[PDB]
Enzyme design. Structure first.
Site, PDB file in Angstrom:
ATOM      1  N   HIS A 144      11.621  31.673-133.762  1.00 20.68           N
ATOM      2  CA  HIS A 144      11.036  32.679-132.890  1.00 20.68           C
ATOM      3  C   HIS A 144      10.104  31.979-131.917  1.00 20.68           C
ATOM      4  O   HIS A 144       9.321  31.114-132.315  1.00 20.68           O
ATOM      5  CB  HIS A 144      10.280  33.752-133.680  1.00 20.68           C
ATOM      6  CG  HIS A 144       9.542  34.729-132.819  1.00 20.68           C
ATOM      7  ND1 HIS A 144       8.357  34.420-132.185  1.00 20.68           N
ATOM      8  CD2 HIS A 144       9.822  36.011-132.485  1.00 20.68           C
ATOM      9  CE1 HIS A 144       7.940  35.468-131.499  1.00 20.68           C
ATOM     10  NE2 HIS A 144       8.811  36.447-131.665  1.00 20.68           N
TER      11      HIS A 144
ATOM     12  N   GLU B   6      -0.185  35.374-129.126  1.00 18.72           N
ATOM     13  CA  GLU B   6       0.285  35.006-130.456  1.00 18.72           C
ATOM     14  C   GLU B   6      -0.467  33.797-131.000  1.00 18.72           C
ATOM     15  O   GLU B   6      -0.753  33.727-132.202  1.00 18.72           O
ATOM     16  CB  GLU B   6       1.788  34.745-130.417  1.00 18.72           C
ATOM     17  CG  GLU B   6       2.608  36.004-130.196  1.00 18.72           C
ATOM     18  CD  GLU B   6       3.970  35.721-129.602  1.00 18.72           C
ATOM     19  OE1 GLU B   6       4.761  36.675-129.445  1.00 18.72           O
ATOM     20  OE2 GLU B   6       4.253  34.546-129.289  1.00 18.72           O
TER      21      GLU B   6
ATOM     22  N   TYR C 100       4.325  42.316-134.627  1.00 16.09           N
ATOM     23  CA  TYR C 100       5.415  42.894-133.843  1.00 16.09           C
ATOM     24  C   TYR C 100       5.027  44.278-133.326  1.00 16.09           C
ATOM     25  O   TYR C 100       5.598  45.302-133.699  1.00 16.09           O
ATOM     26  CB  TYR C 100       6.691  42.952-134.676  1.00 16.09           C
ATOM     27  CG  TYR C 100       7.341  41.607-134.894  1.00 16.09           C
ATOM     28  CD1 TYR C 100       7.968  40.945-133.850  1.00 16.09           C
ATOM     29  CD2 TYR C 100       7.336  41.004-136.143  1.00 16.09           C
ATOM     30  CE1 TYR C 100       8.565  39.717-134.040  1.00 16.09           C
ATOM     31  CE2 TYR C 100       7.932  39.775-136.342  1.00 16.09           C
ATOM     32  CZ  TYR C 100       8.545  39.138-135.286  1.00 16.09           C
ATOM     33  OH  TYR C 100       9.141  37.915-135.478  1.00 16.09           O
TER      34      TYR C 100
ATOM     35  N   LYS D  97      11.498  30.871-139.243  1.00 20.71           N
ATOM     36  CA  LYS D  97      11.703  32.048-140.068  1.00 20.71           C
ATOM     37  C   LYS D  97      12.081  31.655-141.496  1.00 20.71           C
ATOM     38  O   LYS D  97      12.421  30.500-141.759  1.00 20.71           O
ATOM     39  CB  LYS D  97      12.792  32.918-139.444  1.00 20.71           C
ATOM     40  CG  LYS D  97      12.384  33.572-138.136  1.00 20.71           C
ATOM     41  CD  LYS D  97      13.288  34.748-137.813  1.00 20.71           C
ATOM     42  CE  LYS D  97      12.764  35.544-136.633  1.00 20.71           C
ATOM     43  NZ  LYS D  97      12.890  34.786-135.362  1.00 20.71           N
TER      44      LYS D  97
ATOM     45  N   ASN E  86      17.962  34.467-136.715  1.00 22.40           N
ATOM     46  CA  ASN E  86      18.202  33.400-135.756  1.00 22.40           C
ATOM     47  C   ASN E  86      17.379  32.150-136.050  1.00 22.40           C
ATOM     48  O   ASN E  86      17.397  31.205-135.253  1.00 22.40           O
ATOM     49  CB  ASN E  86      17.939  33.902-134.335  1.00 22.40           C
ATOM     50  CG  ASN E  86      16.518  34.379-134.132  1.00 22.40           C
ATOM     51  OD1 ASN E  86      15.684  34.293-135.031  1.00 22.40           O
ATOM     52  ND2 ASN E  86      16.232  34.887-132.939  1.00 22.40           N
TER      53      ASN E  86
END
Lengths: 201, 102, 140, 335, 249, 249
Positions: free
Chosen positions: A118, A129, A49, A9, A115
């Site tokens: 992913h 994905e 998403y 991220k 976080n």
């Protein structure tokens, strides 16, 4: 040997911690078969998403992932999905610090949703994905080669335009030489198809 | 597919490089002091030559100027030029009074 | 700093221990001054919040703690001889230790980490005192 | 044949590609010291923006100093000498920093970064007033040439005394914690300033007759008729004298004597530190206290292995402070 | 990629670290290293370091070797050392015994420049200065000798040769990219299996140059330039390791 | 075995021939070569040469290619050229169309300093000085650009790539050991196939450094060290051509 998706991220990239994460990943037996640094747009992030689609955290989640470049990786390992789930540790960063320290979320991740990593949940989402971000990465030769599934995919693909192309080839009957027929049917397919439009200047 | 220039087996130094070896030894001798050489047939040392009293210019200084200007030889060649000037002016057989590098 | 020992007639004699937020020293004392084979153990607390030089150190469990088998030294006449109530040099004083010597001739090793409040003098009578660990550094 | 025959359906990727290129701010800043930056133009009126002329700092012959240092075989390289000269010109010229003098102090290594120090003059025991004693000079600090300039704070006697008891490797953050047991009263900037004060007051020297004291202003002046000694003879400790005032054990340049009470003094009011005499300014390096054994404080360094060479260079290197060096060739000298 | 480290590259990349050589010595090395290399049969011979002395005649030390074998699970480079006071003439640096090295270890401070001195130790023992110099040099060489990881490779007849297909050390700002030469190429032992705080690494990513400094021996420096794929190491200072290292960290 | 010639080794080995650059310009080059290499997206960028002007402000010229492919029997490199009066800031050299590329070869004499100079030729034709400089650089590159033979190889998709297993050229004294850059690896075309007396090679057998100087273009030098496989080239001096070669030899 299975392949899982992963992504770093923007929070672990704006802090210049991407290479450390990659080296840690390589240290734990993983293999990075494909990597790419990229920058999602709003529409692409919303399409990625799709499972949430209007949940409480969705606005901030999609506003965060489009705040800077991220990294996309395809990791390969015999137990890749479960091992990478363990390696990332618990999703919540504070719960991660409390329970399992020296995990990538505890070290680099901060502040809840950021976080810093992913990962994919199940092989279905992993393959989805991977195809989403690496359209030309070959994989999964067993789940597509079933005679039933092969016939079903051919059925889904051929009625739209290939049958009409064959009918036009039979009716027009161009030169008996097969190369001219191949060229004509290819032109017909690339000109008449339900998926793409017709382009004009 | 083996590449064209795979390998070669040459000696450490070509057997036809005596002139280059002599030039290298001569240029290396410019540095430091000449160590005393003991004579053959005995252990008595051979006294060195009494040097000549000459005059010269600053060769490191103008080497630095030319390096700053980006002209002339390298700074590693101007030092050897200084040493060669010193050797020429120091010889007794050919008596000079002033030396300069053209 | 917490200083633990078995004292004799107002002075420390024998094995004694001294602990400070990052440091832990232990060894023989004679008449209140260190002497004989000792051991130092302390952590690099200043670089706990900087990137490691090796990647395997990031996820390891051992901290950056080093232990040295040093040896202090005292003048040969000073100390080691109880006073008679002299040809004996004086003990080193506080502001400057004139005859105190130090020696270290072996490489440091790997040492387990240290927490400052030493759990042997755990009830702290002093009003202000910091704490230290490897997870959290100097807290106050 | 297979390589030539493989299908490759290159299709339009949804995202525009992004460049993977390392950051270039440091190198751009380093480059920005070369050449003159042309005055920017005002878009509204094509006339140039208002500007200031350069400043009139008084620096030494830094290119000659680099030449001497490379001749002796000490100091930094020859290219870094050019970089340092250009960066010092950048510092001195700045009309914002009214600097009366620039001098490259040196370079402190570190664990994570290094420190390029530039000594600058502008135009309970107490501490030295700003501009007196050890606080005479300010010290600008870079991590790389042409980068941002971080000013160091003034030094205090407590910091000097505390630093005298610890041996700490620099980390290079400039905000790190220093020590726990011999508690240092400050962060790494204070520790670096204290180290700078000690080394400066211990190892900044000059040729013997170049400078002379003056009591009316209490300052030292340059001879301007000074005839430099021949090289291979500046390698003698008698050829060099100190220029910086001594640093007392109390922690400052002039000892602080608390005034004794009008009665019951008995001369026992003063401890060891408040009652101490030190060397006078401009003292030759020969009288510096000898090291253990019959060893002088400064060891000789030559520019050549043969005395026959006409023009050579010579200098000294410090024993108590490994890395402090002073040398000269012809009329050019440096420390 | 490179076959041998280049002296000018070493001096150019270590100029900041304070590892420098004088101009005369630099030129003399340039002209004299090949002569001593070819006088012996050594395929390689390069400057090893410059130890500081008391009179002012610094000891220039160079080392060379012919072939690099693997024996008893390690890379055993048979090396030969030479020393000099000037860059012109190179003299042999004789190897010392074991007990003589143990006695070597007890001499501190910089050794004097004259190679005819004798130190007195204790029954009295006389220690020549050349023995002390060789002891210090071999100690430093054993402790720290860095090459990038997998920059070498085994071959037929089991000789450690350079790896002409070296891709470049990935993540070169970390100690896992560098290794001691004695460590075998295949093995995973690198510069991270030694003490945690005896190596420092600085890295410039834009220029792609890494500098590795030894803290046990504060004079040992190493560079790795990734764009050119060239590495090299040098030593400058007296052969003393700082035993009081922990208080320094 | 190298992949790109160093800018420091070239200046070191060609210093004797007068192929030197100012120290300030050398530091500026060291800093500002990677900056332009990243600003232009070029995998290879090296200093090509230095051309003299009527001012002290010589033109430093650097060339860099991104792709290099075989095309109609010619190893075509898609080179880009940049110029700079000082080592700091670089500008581009746009290619020249054929009409002015033929009207620029008749203009002689050493160039001026300002790249905004217009030469007037014979009605009057106005030609920019940058065009003339580009013409001269192109002519010198066509006539001179030299690399050792077998140092490049052809892979799949017909791209010329460095030969990682290049073991070096035996007989470096012979001109046969060297070839132009735009010669295909398979073809046996070398500098021997040029005019007989237009290339002078001086080889020092001891140090193992060969030096090739161009006599048709007097200011082009190319060194090749064989003990460590390192070859480089530089052009220093005005770009004019030596027409009367027959009389001089």
């Amino acid at each position: 040997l299975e392949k899982t998706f992963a992504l770093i991220k923007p929070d672990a990239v704006r802090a210049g911690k991407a290479q450390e994460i990659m080296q840690l990943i390589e240290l734990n037996g993983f293999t990075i078969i494909a990597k790419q640094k990229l920058q999602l747009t709003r529409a692409r992030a919303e399409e990625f998403y799709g499972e949430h689609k209007g949940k409480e955290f969705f606005p901030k989640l999609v506003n965060f992932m489009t705040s800077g470049p991220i990294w996309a990786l395809v990791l390969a390992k015999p137990g890749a999905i479960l091992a990478w789930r363990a390696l990332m540790g618990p999703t919540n960063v504070f719960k991660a610090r409390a329970e399992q320290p020296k995990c990538l979320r505890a070290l680099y991740g901060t502040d809840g949703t950021q976080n810093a990593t992913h990962g994919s949940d199940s092989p279905i989402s992993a393959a989805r994905e991977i195809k989403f971000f690496f359209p030309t990465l070959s994989g999964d030769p067993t789940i597509y080669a079933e005679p039933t599934a092969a016939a079903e995919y051919i059925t889904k693909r051929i009625q739209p335009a290939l049958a009409k192309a064959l009918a036009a080839l039979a009716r027009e009957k161009p030169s008996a030489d097969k190369f001219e027929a191949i060229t004509f049917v290819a032109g017909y397919l690339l000109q008449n198809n339900p998926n793409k439009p017709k382009v004009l200047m | 597919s083996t590449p064209p220039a795979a390998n070669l087996s040459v000696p450490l130094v070509p057997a036809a490089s005596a002139a280059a070896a002599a030039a290298a030894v001569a240029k290396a001798s410019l540095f430091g002091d000449p160590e005393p050489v003991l004579d053959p047939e005995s252990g008595e040392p051979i006294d060195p030559d009494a040097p000549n009293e000459f005059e010269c210019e600053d060769v490191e200084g103008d080497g630095d100027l030319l390096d700053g200007l980006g002209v002339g030889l390298g700074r590693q060649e101007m030092y050897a030029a200084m040493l060669a000037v010193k050797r020429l002016g120091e010889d007794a057989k050919r008596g000079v009074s002033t030396v300069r590098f053209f | 700093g917490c200083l633990r020992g078995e004292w004799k007639k107002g002075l420390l004699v024998g094995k004694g221990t001294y602990e400070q937020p990052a440091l832990r020293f232990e060894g023989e004392f004679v008449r209140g001054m260190p002497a004989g084979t000792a051991t130092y153990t302390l952590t690099g607390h200043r670089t706990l919040d900087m990137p490691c030089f090796a990647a395997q150190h990031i996820q390891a469990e051992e901290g950056p703690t080093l232990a040295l088998p040093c040896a202090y030294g005292i003048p040969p006449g000073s100390g080691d001889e109880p006073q008679l109530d002299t040809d004996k040099p004086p003990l080193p004083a506080h502001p400057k230790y004139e005859g105190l010597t130090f020696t270290a001739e072996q490489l440091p090793g790997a040492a387990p980490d240290t927490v400052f409040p030493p759990e042997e003098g755990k009830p702290v009578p002093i009003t202000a005192v910091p704490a230290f660990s490897v997870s959290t550094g100097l807290v106050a | 044949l297979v390589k030539k025959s493989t299908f490759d359906p290159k299709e339009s990727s949804p995202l525009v590609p992004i460049p993977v290129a390392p950051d270039a701010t440091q190198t751009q800043a380093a480059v920005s010291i070369f050449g003159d930056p042309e005055l920017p133009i005002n878009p509204a009126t094509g006339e140039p923006v208002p500007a200031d002329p350069p400043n009139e700092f008084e620096a030494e012959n830094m290119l000659g100093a680099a030449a001497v240092l490379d001749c002796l075989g000490v100091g930094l390289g020859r290219e870094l000498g050019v970089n340092i000269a250009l960066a010092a010109k950048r510092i001195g010229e700045d009309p914002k920093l009214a600097v009366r003098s620039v001098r490259f102090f040196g370079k402190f290594l570190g664990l994570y970064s290094d420190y390029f120090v530039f000594e600058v003059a502008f135009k309970e025991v107490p501490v030295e007033e700003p501009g007196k004693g050890a606080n005479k000079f300010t010290y600008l600090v870079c991590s790389s040439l042409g980068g941002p300039l971080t000013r160091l704070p003034d030094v205090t006697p407590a910091q000097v005394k505390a630093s005298r008891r610890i041996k700490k490797l620099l980390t290079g953050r400039l905000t790190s914690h220093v020590s726990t047991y011999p508690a240092f009263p400050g962060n790494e900037a204070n520790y670096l300033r204290a180290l700078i004060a000690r080394i400066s007051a211990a190892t900044v020297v000059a040729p013997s007759d170049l400078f002379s004291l003056n009591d009316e202003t209490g300052e030292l002046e340059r001879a301007e008729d000074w005839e430099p000694p021949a090289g291979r003879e500046m390698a003698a400790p008698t050829a060099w004298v100190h220029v910086r005032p001594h640093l007392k054990s109390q922690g400052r340049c002039e000892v602080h004597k608390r005034e004794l009470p009008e009665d019951a003094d008995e001369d026992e009011f003063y401890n060891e530190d408040e009652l101490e005499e030190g060397p006078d300014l401009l003292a030759a390096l020969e009288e510096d206290a000898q090291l253990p054994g019959e060893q002088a404080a400064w060891t000789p360094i030559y520019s050549s292995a043969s005395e026959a060479v006409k023009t050579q260079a010579g200098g000294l290197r410090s024993l108590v402070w490994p890395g402090a060096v002073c040398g000269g060739r012809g009329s050019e000298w440096t420390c | 990629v490179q076959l041998e480290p280049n002296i000018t590259l070493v001096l150019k990349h270590l100029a900041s670290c304070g590892a420098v050589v004088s101009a005369e010595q630099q030129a003399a090395l340039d002209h004299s290293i090949p002569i001593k290399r070819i006088e012996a049969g050594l395929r390689s011979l390069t400057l090893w370091g410059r130890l500081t002395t008391l009179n002012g005649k610094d000891y220039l030390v160079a080392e060379g070797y012919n072939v690099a074998s693997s024996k008893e699970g390690a890379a055993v480079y048979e090396t030969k050392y030479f020393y000099s006071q000037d860059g012109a003439r190179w003299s042999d640096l004789q190897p010392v015994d074991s007990e003589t090295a143990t006695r070597c270890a007890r001499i501190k401070g910089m050794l004097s420049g004259d190679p005819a001195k004798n130190y007195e130790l204790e029954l009295v023992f006389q220690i020549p200065e050349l023995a002390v110099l060789r002891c210090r040099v071999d100690a430093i060489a054993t402790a720290t000798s860095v090459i990038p990881t997998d920059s070498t490779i085994l071959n037929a007849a089991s000789q450690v040769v350079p790896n002409r297909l070296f891709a470049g050390a990935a993540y070169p700002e970390k100690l896992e990219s560098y290794q001691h030469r004695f460590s075998l190429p295949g093995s995973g032992v690198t510069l991270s299996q030694d003490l945690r705080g005896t190596w420092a690494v600085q890295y410039d990513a834009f220029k792609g140059v890494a500098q590795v400094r030894s803290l046990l021996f504060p004079g040992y420096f190493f560079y790795y330039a990734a764009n050119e794929l060239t590495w090299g190491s040098l030593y400058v200072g007296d052969g003393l390791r700082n035993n009081d290292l922990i208080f320094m960290l």
